[PDB]
């Protein structure tokens, strides 16, 4: 058990390297990559050159492996600081390993700086970006995450300075972000509550058990809607059958596609201006007789 | 591997595969290599050589 323990036992299998060692490793990697490029770039393939380039590629693979394994422990050192947030320790360690792999393909020995100098930047970048990307259920834009963290830091600084939790107005004044955007950010900075959490000690039944479906009401769709549809199929049919077809095409009772005045006039051969009067007649008829008696509800 | 098998009591994987629970838990979590197979026939035919 303790996967962290086994990884930390494995990571220390290799010791660190001095400046000269890292410089020679960078030189070896440069030679390896040069041979790799030449192997496929050359139009005429040398025979002994083939074997030499194969050996150089093997040595370059070994060199990158050695450099990464030697410098791994910096990954753990940097990752230990970011713990306590959403992601666990090993996730951050893997993020830092990916960052180190990214960095190693750009290191230079001519500058003369130590490898950690050019490795820490990329490790921190990778860890922070990974935490921003895969540490929250509802993923947010990186800029919005940065703004949320800025709001949190401003609030903590104000609390430190004044000895009391900062007011919303003072937060807006210090940060300059209006209260509306501050409220939005605060709403975006809450971990969703888990449904399995016991609620009310009511036999410790989870919160999920008390959430109504909030839709698909039985009685509404069961009786009211279908009976409205049937009574309409009766009433509108009791009108002129031509007018019934006109309504069907006008709103789309059968085939959708609500026919506009001009379109329905073209289909029926009438003019765009007749449909307004047709609809006036239909609405006048629908408001009198047994039609009103049936359809007084549903409004 | 399914958790229900290499961790159950009895561990069906252990019983079927005649591996002690400690060795099984070590192998699953990438602790120690294991020799899956060997060309025993070639080794025997080449035992002299």
């Amino acid at each position: 058990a303790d996967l962290v323990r086994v990884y930390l036992n494995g990571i220390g299998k290799t010791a660190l390297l001095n400046a000269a060692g890292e410089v020679e490793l960078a030189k070896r990697i440069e030679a390896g990559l040069y041979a790799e490029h030449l192997l496929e770039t050359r139009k005429r393939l040398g025979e002994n050159r083939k074997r030499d380039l194969a050996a150089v590629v093997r040595d370059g693979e070994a060199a990158r492996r050695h450099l990464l394994e030697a410098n791994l422990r910096l990954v753990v050192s940097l990752a230990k600081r970011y713990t306590g947030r959403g992601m666990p320790l090993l996730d951050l360690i893997q993020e830092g390993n990916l960052g180190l792999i990214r960095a190693m393909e750009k290191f230079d020995y001519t500058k003369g700086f130590k490898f950690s100098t050019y490795a820490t930047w990329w490790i921190r970048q990778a860890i922070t970006r990974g935490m921003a990307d895969q540490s929250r259920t509802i993923r947010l834009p990186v800029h919005l995450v940065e703004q949320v963290n800025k709001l949190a830091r401003i609030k903590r600084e104000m609390h430190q300075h004044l000895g009391r939790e900062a007011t919303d107005e003072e937060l807006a004044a210090e940060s300059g972000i209006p209260i509306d955007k501050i409220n939005d950010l605060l709403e975006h900075s809450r971990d969703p509550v888990s449904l399995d959490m016991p609620v009310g000690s009511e036999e410790e039944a989870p919160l999920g058990d008390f959430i109504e479906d909030a839709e698909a009401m039985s009685a509404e769709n069961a009786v009211i809607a279908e009976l409205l549809h049937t009574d309409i199929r009766s009433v509108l049919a009791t009108l002129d059958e031509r007018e019934h077809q006109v309504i069907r095409l006008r709103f789309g009772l059968d085939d959708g596609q609500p026919r506009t005045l001009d379109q329905i006039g073209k289909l029926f051969g009438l003019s765009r201006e007749r449909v307004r009067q047709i609809e006036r007649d239909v609405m006048s008829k629908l408001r009198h007789g047994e039609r009103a008696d049936r359809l007084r509800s549903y409004a | 591997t399914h958790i229900w098998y290499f961790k159950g009591v009895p561990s069906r994987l252990g019983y079927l595969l005649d591996l002690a629970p400690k060795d099984l838990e070590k192998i699953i979590y990438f602790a120690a290599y294991v020799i899956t197979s060997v060309d025993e026939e070639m080794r025997h035919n080449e035992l002299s050589t």
Partner: protein
């Protein structure tokens, strides 16, 4: 006190004052949590005196 000792181990020693060294958030949080969720802090039943 844990937070304070960490902060004083890290923060500069020249211009340090206890005002910038104390963090009042955890204690108020603990008091509010106790008075809100503690099982020994109950609604006073008021059927009658």
């Amino acid at each position: 006190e844990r937070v304070v000792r960490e902060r004083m181990t890290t923060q500069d020693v020249e211009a340090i004052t206890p005002q910038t060294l104390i963090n009042i958030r955890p204690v108020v949080a603990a008091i509010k949590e106790f008075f809100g969720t503690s099982q020994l802090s109950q609604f006073m039943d008021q059927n009658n005196p």
